[PDB]
Amino acid sequence: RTRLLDSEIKIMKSEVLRVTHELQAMKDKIK
Amino acid sequence: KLLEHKEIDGRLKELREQLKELTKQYEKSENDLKALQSVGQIVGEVLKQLTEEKFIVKATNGPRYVVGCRRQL
């Protein structure tokens, strides 16, 4: 298959983006 | 393939939109933090001009002061 690799890459990116965004955007308001 | 992540893209867009709005408020809050460092200023009226950098001003609460003037003004 060819799209199987793309799906895995997209899933990995989503996890990083969610964690990274919270550590920066949320922190500024609370700080 | 034919479908790929086109159908799955709906879930990602909805989650991103909700989180995106949260970051918008952070910019608004920063504006308030930029105002906490601005202090007030006593208000009085000029009475006479002794020299170019010396003025006689009476604060509209109390005594009369001889004070300077900001260069740019």
Curated annotation (Swiss-Prot), chain A:
Protein name: 26S proteasome regulatory subunit 6A
Disorder named in the UniProt entry: Deafness, cataract, impaired intellectual development, and polyneuropathy: An autosomal recessive disease characterized by early onset of deafness, cataract, severe developmental delay, and severely impaired intellectual development. Patients later develop polyneuropathy of the lower extremities, associated with depigmentation of the hair in that area.
UniProt-annotated location(s): Cytoplasm; Nucleus
Quaternary structure (record): Component of the 19S proteasome regulatory particle complex. The 26S proteasome consists of a 20S core particle (CP) and two 19S regulatory subunits (RP). The regulatory particle is made of a lid composed of 9 subunits, a base containing 6 ATPases including PSMC3 and few additional components. Interacts with PAAF1.
Residues of the full protein shown: 44 to 74 of 439
Primary role: Component of the 26S proteasome, a multiprotein complex involved in the ATP-dependent degradation of ubiquitinated proteins. This complex plays a key role in the maintenance of protein homeostasis by removing misfolded or damaged proteins, which could impair cellular functions, and by removing proteins whose functions are no longer required. Therefore, the proteasome participates in numerous cellular processes, including cell cycle progression, apoptosis, or DNA damage repair.
Family: Belongs to the AAA ATPase family.
PTM comment, free text: Sumoylated by UBE2I in response to MEKK1-mediated stimuli.
